Amino acid sequence: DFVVVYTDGCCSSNGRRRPRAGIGVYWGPGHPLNVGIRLPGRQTNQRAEIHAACKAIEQAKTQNINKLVLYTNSMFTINGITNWVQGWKKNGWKTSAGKEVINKEDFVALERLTQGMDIQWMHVPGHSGFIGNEEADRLAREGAKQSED
């Protein structure tokens, strides 16, 4: 009934001068939907993690899939979409310190995708998961090595 997918977002030189952010998605051994692309827009790891998910819900919708089990090591991504967003719409998208929520654009994009979607968000220990997370990371790393389109 459900489908299991592994996503990762990386970023070479995160917070440095020339950051390169990539995303990776893993469905199955040699699954043709396995992808590792350079992330357009601002080059951060947090944006890569959110949009690495985003691409998974994107691809699942093109497969008439609505029940998803989504794996990512980003507690930022998981806690934001499952918790913080509801309070953010209520307080005008303001962090605990009163400043604007930086990745609002990415979280709005993510939730817009979760509509009509039944996703079970699951966390992976970044250094203790099995080959699903390990590979998905490798797709992200090699995706950040590419140029944009």
Add this chain to the structure above:
RNA sequence: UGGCGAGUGGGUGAGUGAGG
């Protein structure tokens, strides 16, 4: 009061740069 920018030190986890 509104706007803006730095911190403080606990939590969540992430992504890195340089070396053995």
Add this chain to the structure above:
DNA sequence: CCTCACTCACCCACTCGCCA
């Protein structure tokens, strides 16, 4: 496995500064 240096961003909350 070991060592230095970071940022990305949020939760909890109380402090400095800047502008009307």
